[PDB]
Each structure stands twice: as C-alpha cells, then as structure tokens.
C-alpha cells in the first residue's frame, strides 16, 4: 500500500472476507473465554464446537492452521 | 473358676458388616465419580474416561 503496487478490487474484496472473518475469529476467542470468566461454566466447549469450521477454512485457504502466509506483497498468496 | 472374664475376652464384636459398608461406600464413590466424569463432560462433548 505504500509504494502503490496496485491491489485489484477483487483481491481487496477477498482480503475483506478475510478481515471480516477475523472479526469472528476474535469475537469467539474472547466471548467463549469471557463466558468461562464471567460465570458461564458450560458454554466453553460450545463456542469451540462452533469455531471448528473456521479451522477448516483457515487450513484450506492458505496455511496450516492459522492460515499463515495468506499475504504476499503483490497481492495475496 | 471365672478369674477375670470367661466369655468377655474379645468374642462379643464382629467387624464384618462395617467392612461391608466400607466396601459399598467406596464402590459408590467410584460410581458417582464415573457419573460425573461421564455426564458432566459429555452433555455436548466426547465420552468420559475411556
């Protein structure tokens, strides 16, 4: 974004999908543990069962489990 | 004669039923911990202590 290697708007929308899924990746990994801190004793494993699908997504997208190396320089991986 | 005590040496008490209660309560402790570790962590989870 600094040296202006023009990122297409389609790849930009792909990155938007990424970012708005990471919003979920944060919402779960807070609320679940937040439920396990506030007093909600049972739903701990519940939110992990919900999150299981994001694991398959991050795996099949670019990387092993955290989707590592989904951002190259001239676009994405 | 009856110098100190004829029938009162040690033969008036039996410790069988007390030990049966001990065995029963220990077995029931096993049952209840099995109940816990197999129902609490298995409502929406995997099986307990397999």
Curated annotation (Swiss-Prot), chain B:
Highest taxon above the source species: Eukaryota
Segments crossing the lipid bilayer: 15-35
Record localization: Plastid, Chloroplast thylakoid membrane
Function, as annotated: NDH shuttles electrons from NAD(P)H:plastoquinone, via FMN and iron-sulfur (Fe-S) centers, to quinones in the photosynthetic chain and possibly in a chloroplast respiratory chain. The immediate electron acceptor for the enzyme in this species is believed to be plastoquinone. Couples the redox reaction to proton translocation, and thus conserves the redox energy in a proton gradient.
Subunit structure: NDH is composed of at least 16 different subunits, 5 of which are encoded in the nucleus.
Entry similarity comment: Belongs to the complex I subunit 1 family.
Protein name: NAD(P)H-quinone oxidoreductase subunit 1, chloroplastic
Source organism of the structure: Hordeum vulgare (Barley)
Full protein segment contained here: 15 to 64 of 362
């Amino acid at each position: 974004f600094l040296e202006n290697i023009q990122i297409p708007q389609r790849a930009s929308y792909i990155r938007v999908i990424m970012l708005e899924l990471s919003r979920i990746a944060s919402h779960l990994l807070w609320l679940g543990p937040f439920m396990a801190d506030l007093g909600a004793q049972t739903p701990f494993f519940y939110i992990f069962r919900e999150r299981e699908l994001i694991y398959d997504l991050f795996e099949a997208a670019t990387g092993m489990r955290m989707m590592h190396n989904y951002f190259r320089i001239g676009g994405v991986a | 004669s009856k110098l100190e005590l004829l029938k009162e040496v040690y033969g008036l008490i039996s410790i069988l039923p007390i030990l049966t209660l001990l065995l029963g309560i220990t077995i029931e402790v096993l049952v209840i911990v099995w109940l816990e570790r197999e129902i609490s962590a298995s409502i929406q989870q995997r099986i307990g202590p397999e």
